[PDB]
């Protein structure tokens, strides 16, 4: 018989094999369509989820009840120290797909990057790209290099730069810097390639990719939760108290007579550590890192035009389970995928953004900087020292 009282089914099939993702670094499954017209640029970046916090802002959507009313708002800090371009890699269209065609690597490559290429660095002699870099200083090699670049000019269509992180500049344990292919979207391929050939071995900061009040897509791996039962992993009803063989289950897997259990039926398995591409996360603040002209410039982070203090986005006692954000960072609206410390791919949108909400200009009023390691009540240490007065530790 039919099921009596209808109800929409639990969980989406558009997300499954609900298995542990192969990758850790979230792949960009599609870069935006390079119109050939606008100038060249990078489409993606690779940051790190340092931590959350508040903002306060005046909102300007006329019509709303909240028009010209200061709301608060959660935000993620994605610490994003500049990447280093160490390669380009040409692709060519085929009817089979999109074959990689030619990879030209830079001359010098950091041990940050070289780390990646060995499973055990302690034990290696660190001999990678050793016979490669010989090419970059002779007649023969330099000529072959030029012919490779020329061939890419003749044949290739898509060009991706290879860059990698500056694992050096982070509070993370790891030294093995994440590489990633990032796509150069812009003018003609010959122009496109000579841009990336100029950028080779060079820094690239965040502000060169992204701008403020820009919708971007966060790509990463979800905070993993191990083996989980069907009630956790699918949010199935619990069965009642009296159930004899347990109650965090599904009762009827399936009907008798497709005499197999279907792929659509809810089973217990891996919950979390899935790959996920959340879209439309507006950049409220691209924040300038600590720098030196005479003394430190720690202010330039979490100070606003209306606050004017001497904060950084770092709260008291740091971001928890992370560190100090001593580098440039972006500040997205809302939560994003994954854990603290997780490497996170940003990506420019796939989508022509023209909604009132997606063109809204964000002027921040106040960044909360109170500790997250307990219930914080002081924004800065100087404020605390004022409020408390002197302590026995003096």
């Amino acid at each position: 018989s039919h099921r009596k009282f209808s109800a929409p089914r639990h969980g989406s099939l558009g997300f499954l094999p609900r298995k542990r993702s192969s990758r850790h670094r979230g792949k960009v499954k599609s870069f935006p369509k390079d119109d050939p017209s606008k100038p060249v640029h990078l489409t993606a970046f690779l940051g790190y989820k340092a931590g959350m916090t508040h903002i306060v802002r005046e909102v300007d959507r006329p019509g709303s009840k909240v028009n010209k009313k200061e709301v608060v708002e959660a935000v993620t800090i994605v610490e994003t120290p500049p990447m280093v371009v160490v390669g380009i890699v040409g692709y060519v269209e085929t009817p089979r797909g999109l074959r990689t065609f030619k990879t030209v690597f830079a001359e010098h490559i950091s041990d940050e990057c070289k780390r990646r290429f060995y499973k055990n660095w302690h034990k290696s002699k660190k001999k990678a790209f050793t016979k490669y870099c010989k090419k970059w200083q002779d007649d023969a090699g330099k000529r072959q290099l030029d012919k490779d670049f020329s061939s890419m000019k003749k044949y290739c269509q898509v060009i991706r730069v290879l860059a990698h992180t500056q694992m050096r500049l982070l509070p993370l344990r790891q030294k093995k810097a994440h590489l990633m292919e990032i796509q150069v979207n812009g003018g003609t391929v010959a122009e496109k390639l000579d841009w990336a050939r100029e950028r080779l071995e060079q820094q690239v900061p965040v502000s060169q990719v992204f701008g403020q009040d820009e919708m971007i897509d966060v790509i990463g791996v979800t905070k993993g939760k191990g083996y989980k039962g069907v009630t956790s992993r699918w949010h199935t009803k619990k069965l009642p108290r009296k159930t004899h063989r347990g109650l965090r289950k599904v009762a009827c897997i399936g009907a008798w007579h497709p005499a197999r259990v279907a792929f659509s039926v809810a089973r217990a398995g891996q919950k979390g550590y899935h790959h996920r591409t959340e879209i439309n996360k507006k950049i409220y603040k691209i924040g300038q890192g600590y720098l030196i002209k005479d003394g430190k410039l720690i202010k330039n982070n979490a100070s606003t035009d209306y606050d004017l203090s001497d904060k950084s986005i770092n709260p008291l006692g740091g971001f928890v389970h992370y560190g100090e954000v001593t580098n440039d960072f972006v500040m997205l609206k809302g939560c994003v995928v994954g854990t603290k410390k997780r490497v996170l791919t940003l990506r420019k949108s796939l989508l022509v953004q023209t909604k009132r909400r997606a063109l809204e200009k964000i002027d921040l009023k106040f960044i909360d900087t109170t500790s997250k390691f307990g219930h914080g009540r002081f924004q800065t240490v100087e404020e605390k020292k004022a409020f408390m007065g002197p302590l026995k530790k003096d």
Binding site: V56, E70, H375, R377, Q379, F387
Partner: protein
């Protein structure tokens, strides 16, 4: 962003945090956190409780 003061302890309450109580007499209280609010609801006279501002004013601490 009018920073308010905790009706128990005395600390300031920054926009994000804490909770707002609206008693039927028709007067309102702000609590920094639950710790304050619990002492308030259990009727603890904050001048008796050391860590509050009201106590330390009463006992002339600092200065």
């Amino acid at each position: 962003m009018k920073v308010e003061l905790c009706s128990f302890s005395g600390y300031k309450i920054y926009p994000g945090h804490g909770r707002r109580y609206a008693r039927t007499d028709g007067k309102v209280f702000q609590f920094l956190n639950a710790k304050c609010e619990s002492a308030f609801l259990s009727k603890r006279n904050p001048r008796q409780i050391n860590w509050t501002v009201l106590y330390r004013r009463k006992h002339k601490k600092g200065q």
